[PDB]
Design a protein around this ligand. Structure first.
Ligand SMILES: O=C(O)CCCC(=O)O
Ligand SMILES: O=C(O)CCCC(=O)O
Ligand code: SF4
Ligand code: SF4
Ligand SMILES: [Ca+2]
Ligand SMILES: [Ca+2]
Lengths: 611, 611
């Protein structure tokens, strides 16, 4: 067996039992890795479990690309049943832990149970142990990783959670190297519910490879294709930050709880303001086009900036100064919570406060009051902070404000306002983990321009586009698992991936093999959702926030414009038609059979009727 | 089996293998523990090994008294074939690591082999792992323990080495809780040769006790006896620091490399001075008469003072200010090196400079120069720091300065000058592990007074009092293992020890049983020494330094007075007669049998002729 090890590391924090599970090579070929392997595990071992209970499974999954020198192939998926959405959840993050876990001899690490006291998992090749992390509990993500490296060395990958993960904030995440995050859907809350403060990994093994020479040829070429791409220079300069100006110009910039797609102070928080505030640039393992742009915030501290971070904590909050948005950004990072869901919950609170619904709380443009709430959420302090720490869906039900609750399936909407973008909106509505642009960032295509550098329409081909993209971004790249930006941003030929896959594993994968493998994962995940919800499911699940229907842009040539229900409903049906799902968004027995997901039928039939 | 677990933890740094060896109940009954158990182990497992080679065994041996609430019973022994002496070496220190080791289900821990990189041993009950310490190597013992506690919490026992151990300074020791130390013969240099930086222990298990009620009552009774003894108030004030004045009053205070027994500036480095420089008081686990007195040094740094540290690093160096001696004290502690051997090796250099044998180096009184040499020794900087790091015996061989080399068997002499004290001289000459006062601090009885508050004679009864003292100090107390000071200083009845042992292990030990056990340990160790010295051995190995025979006190009414070789030789013969040894200091066959050491005879018989 090449590329894959065929081994999964298992740790039971309740019994302290540690073992290695071997899985069949055909499971490897079938799901490839990352989100593929993660969905397989959660389907079998996370049936009906309470998201914050010890029975839920915290999965750290890499793919055949990880552990090896591959173009930006230092990513890693973190999956578990989501405490926020209640369905399947996962996220991705770059980290040397990805490299170590795999050189250590594992394709994945599954964690179950819950320790009696704060602990952290230590892995050094075959030497794996559960140690006390009692002295760490309470410390930021930055400090925890720092102290751990001060004991074990620099040659390690470290995953940690901040006070927000410990306090179980629904959108808490897992951090690494003061900047990389993963698990918007509560993966950090799960890691916290298990009394797991961190994971430290070091691996020195040689990962078996089918064609060593071709792996080197391909990698060198792909690396050089990046270096020589026309978009490399501007990418190096602004990274994902270039989307601020791009979204504003196109009215896709979330402003004041997505009330508008235009922000008057966008200049004071864009890639050009960022550029003049930069003091350092970091990146993920094996990446030659780093985009972890570090600036200094209004308090002299370092903040690693990303577009979604700034849009959600900046324009979305009505804050027009980047060094102040940078302060909030850093907090989210050390407290260990999702910048996106955190910004949407705060933005939600500001609107509600302004509407007279909430009596105490910050308003838009209120940096200080926003900074106090971000911290109050991190430590669940007081009534207001504890509520917002539950997310907008939960918060909405309590405050009775479904009106301006920007989420889909329970996950807060990303940094793209879609009042006039059917495809991107469909993208958000159909995301396998909930509202996210992860799997399908189609607004760029739908518009015709890209940050690296209009008449609405619900054309059926858009649903086809959203599906093709999801195969690549929500499928291939999440199973490899490598970075999509090289391809997305600087245009690296995708033809490199099936070839690298064949060089590493020895197995030929055609593009159809991949779309199928990708579609298999999408349906299995959709099935997991349905089963967990006990059959209570239908198309509305796949609907975008209702605000994009009842109101429209508040300024610009498209003022007043929004999305149309009837036409969106058809776009979706078309989507379901392509995927092979009924008008409830549930996969059909024929489709599941097609994708080798037969074993899923008996389980779903017990909760609803299949077609 | 009660009291003892009959279990020994084995860690092989080389192969990483970790197991638990079960040892008989007669072996426990026979050797009781601590030093007893360590000698049995070293005899069998460290046969012909290089003290600094991977084959050497690093032992952390506890005893029936450890892990349980026994009066000042938080001690622990550290043993291994000595790098400085080449014979059996060991030390003792008070540390929570003594309690936690036993509460984890082990009587002792035996490290063997050598890690391929800086590592530390982690123990939490049955969970034992060899972790990376690459980020710790190079840091002071103080910093190492603080950092590990910041990770695993305060509720643990940590044992560490400083750069002196790391660099293999021959008199390198193991440190704990900033101040507590063990292993003068270079236990720290053995820990370092294994690339072992520390040991973190935590125990929660409940130890099997034959009579739980008796143990309680006996202990409650022992503590009160301590609390009410007349010497308690003063002991709380000066600890062992009261020995400076008393030693100066008796011409026993080592001054300028043992050149004299009186120091004109003894007052500014005495217990009353210390008393007015005290900012904190610490102690070992389970002791109600703490004696770790903390002063602020010349540099404002906390320093834990003990008589021996101040005597060999102060008056012995000719340094008369206590805040300056404390500085050298702290350095010893944080670098991980025995204050005694460090001070004697330095004084030796100082005397060597003054006499012009050495062209460079500090002189008596030169604090700045002594501090620099001390730091140069720990880091082995320069020809001088390097030579001095070898100890006076080796240094002397190099400089040809055998005349003022204050050691016996390679181990440097303690803080008691014996120009006119035949018993104490015999104590140093026969100390099992080489020159030390641990096993026989007879000088107080020989004078008729003690610090807690003269005619030279060689009465053969002096050889008896030494053996008697050794049975208790170098035996019982190193086997239990508990602190001897509550008995020595405040006078707690020695009758609690046989009853407590009985209440713990269930066995009834009579004082003759104990005297026999201690004697077994003594003949075994001598056996070890002779065997490892390849039969090359004679009575001179038990002789005190030449200086005390060919020179005398330089001041006071005893001016000019010294020791008579002939009359000492006679005292040694009485010692050998009592112990049942030949005129060569080697145990006699009938003696070995008598002590159940028959298995020693065939082995020694291979290197010399027995009697
Ligand atoms: O700006 C973003 O958040 C998305 C970057 C492009 C991509 O999602 O691949
Ligand atoms: O002052 C010392 O160093 C010795 C204290 C008494 C003893 O050794 O038991
Ligand atoms: S492009 Fe950015 S996110 Fe992707 S691997 Fe490189 S540094 Fe990481
Ligand atoms: S008397 Fe001193 S050395 Fe003995 S146990 Fe107490 S604090 Fe420790
Ligand atoms: Ca980031
Ligand atoms: Ca001390």
């Amino acid at each position: 067996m090449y590329g894959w090890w065929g081994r999964i590391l298992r740790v039971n924090l309740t019994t302290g039992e540690v073992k290695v599970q071997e899985y069949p090579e055909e499971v490897a070929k079938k799901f490839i890795g990352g989100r593929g392997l993660a969905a397989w595990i959660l389907w079998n071992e996370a049936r009906g479990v309470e998201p914050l209970s010890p029975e839920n499974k915290l999965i750290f999954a890499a793919g055949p690309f990880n552990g090896l020198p591959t173009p930006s192939g230092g990513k890693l998926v973190v999956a578990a049943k989501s405490p926020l959405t209640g369905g399947y959840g996962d996220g991705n993050l770059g980290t040397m832990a990805s490299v170590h876990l795999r050189r250590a001899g594992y394709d994945a690490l599954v964690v179950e149970g819950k320790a009696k006291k704060p602990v952290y998992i230590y892995i050094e090749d075959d030497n794996v142990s559960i140690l006390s992390a009692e002295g760490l509990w309470g410390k930021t993500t930055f400090e925890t990783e720092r102290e751990l490296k001060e004991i074990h060395g620099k040659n390690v990958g470290v995953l940690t959670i901040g006070p927000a993960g410990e306090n179980l904030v629904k959108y808490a995440v897992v951090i690494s190297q003061e900047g990389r995050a993963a698990g918007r859907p509560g993966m950090g809350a799960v890691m916290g519910s298990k009394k797991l403060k961190a994971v430290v990994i070091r691996g020195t093994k040689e990962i078996p490879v089918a064609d060593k020479e071709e792996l080197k040829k391909l990698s060198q070429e792909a690396y050089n294709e990046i270096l020589n791409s026309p978009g490399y220079p501007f990418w190096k300069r602004q990274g994902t930050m270039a989307a601020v100006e791009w979204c504003n110009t196109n009215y896709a910039l979330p402003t004041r709880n997505f009330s508008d797609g235009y922000f008057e102070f966008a200049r004071s928080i864009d890639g050009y303001t960022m550029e003049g505030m930069k003091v350092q640039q970091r990146g993920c393992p094996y990446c030659n086009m780093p985009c972890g742009n570090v600036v200094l915030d209004a308090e002299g501290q370092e903040s690693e900036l990303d577009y979604e971070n700034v849009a959600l904590l900046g324009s979305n909050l009505g804050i027009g100064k980047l060094n102040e948005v940078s302060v909030l950004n850093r907090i989210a990072d050390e407290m260990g919570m999702d910048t996106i869901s955190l910004g949407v919950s705060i933005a939600h609170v500001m609107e509600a406060v302004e509407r007279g619904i909430l009596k105490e709380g910050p308003t838009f443009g209120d940096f200080k009051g926003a900074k106090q709430l971000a911290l109050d959420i991190a430590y669940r302090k007081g009534e207001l902070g504890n509520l917002a720490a539950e997310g907008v869906k939960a918060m909405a039900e309590k405050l009775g404000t479904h009106d301006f609750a920007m989420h889909v399936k329970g996950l807060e909407v990303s940094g793209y306002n879609c009042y006039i973008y059917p495809a991107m909106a469909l993208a958000y509505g159909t995301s396998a983990i909930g509202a996210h642009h992860k799997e399908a960032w189609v607004i760029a295509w739908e518009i015709g321009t890209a940050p690296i550098e209009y008449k609405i329409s619900y054309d059926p081909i858009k649903a086809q586009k959203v599906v093709e993209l999801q195969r690549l971004r929500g499928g291939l790249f999440e199973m490899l698992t490598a970075c999509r930006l090289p391809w997305v941003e600087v245009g690296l030929s995708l033809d490199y991936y099936p070839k690298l896959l064949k060089a590493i594993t020895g197995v030929t994968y055609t593009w159809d093999d991949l779309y199928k493998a990708a579609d298999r994962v999408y349906s299995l995940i959709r099935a997991y959702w349905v089963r967990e919800f006990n059959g209570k499911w239908d198309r509305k699940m796949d609907y975008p926030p209702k605000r994009w229907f009842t109101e429209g842009l508040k300024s610009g040539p498209h003022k007043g414009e929004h999305l149309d229900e009837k036409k969106y409903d058809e776009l979706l049906s078309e989507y379901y038609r392509i995927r092979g799902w009924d008008e409830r968004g549930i996969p059909k027995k024929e489709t599941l059979k097609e994708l080798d997901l037969d074993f899923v039928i008996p389980e779903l039939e017990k909760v609803t009727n299949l077609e």
